[PDB]
Design a protein around this ligand. Structure first.
Ligand code: HEM
Ligand code: HEM
Lengths: 137, 137
């Protein structure tokens, strides 16, 4: 289930973080415009860029703490306040986060593994709502 | 589902509030001691005292508000805080709230109606967890 999935991804974090983030950027090529130095590059080229590995893992390290602090896939208000107040997220709307979660859940459905992709969808929806309450447009 | 149930209870709040509360006290007769003016009365004697219906309705009114504000059966931290620092609740522990929820879910299962009894179960467990986080013993 959901609590297991957190452990599964933590167990091979850099592989999953890069694979899911590439899934997102290939499914929504427009989203790359927030990520300047990723335009123009094949997946193998991004995987050899230092910043891409480093940053994507830090995104997923935090997503996993937010997921791990949640009760029934409902995140903490203070975690959503964090996400809205980060300077790197100040250009964003909840729609960007909705698209990330759609790529994430699609990735889990197509994969080998037995993820609880229905919970990840619910977590995504609860998170978008919590971002709305903390102020993000 | 859970949102329908809240509409069902609010529809006939005073009848549900009397019936569920009586179910509670009779299932857990040692809890009656908290309610000084209810000692030594039968169900029908209580249902005939206007201030019995008046208190209980107020209790279940706030319970539905807390339920309605919850996301996927998880209550707001602030609602939990209100319940702990009400001067009327000063000497209670989470065990008292657990019993009310056991009675409440048993009532729902035994009734004609199709309540989402598993979600009320989840809701009670989540509120008790929140009450302790607000420092109830
Ligand atoms: C729950 C989802 C998300 C989490 C936990 C998260 C977390 C983070 C973190 C921890 C950083 C700093 C990374 C670093 O220092 O290396 C970051 C940066 C950034 N984030 Fe997110 N993020 C999320 C969703 C999104 C979405 C959906 C977008 C936009 C499409 C986005 C856009 C950005 C941008 C533009 C940066 C700066 C670029 C970079 O640091 O590589 N984030 N995010
Ligand atoms: C989620 C559950 C509960 C809610 C929403 C709630 C709420 C309330 C409210 C709103 C009142 C004031 C009634 C009024 O002013 O007319 C009250 C009174 C009171 N409550 Fe609770 N309560 C809850 C659970 C409990 C439990 C489980 C106990 C003990 C077993 C308890 C013990 C008392 C006592 C002793 C009073 C004052 C005497 C009375 O009015 O009957 N409460 N409660």
């Amino acid at each position: 289930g959901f609590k297991q999935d957190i452990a599964t991804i933590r167990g091979d974090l850099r592989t999953y973080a890069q694979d899911i983030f590439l899934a997102f950027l290939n499914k929504y090529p427009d989203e790359r415009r927030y990520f300047k130095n990723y335009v123009g590059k094949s997946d193998q080229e991004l995987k050899s860029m230092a910043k891409f590995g480093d940053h994507t893992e830090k995104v997923f390290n935090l997503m996993m703490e937010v997921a791990d602090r949640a009760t029934d896939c409902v995140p903490l208000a203070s975690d959503a306040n964090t996400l809205v107040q980060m300077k790197q997220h100040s250009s964003l709307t909840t729609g960007n986060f909705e698209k990330l979660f759609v790529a994430l859940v699609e990735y889990m459905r197509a994969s080998g593994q037995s993820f609880d992709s229905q919970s990840w969808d619910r977590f995504g929806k609860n998170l978008v709502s919590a971002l709305s309450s903390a102020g993000m447009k």
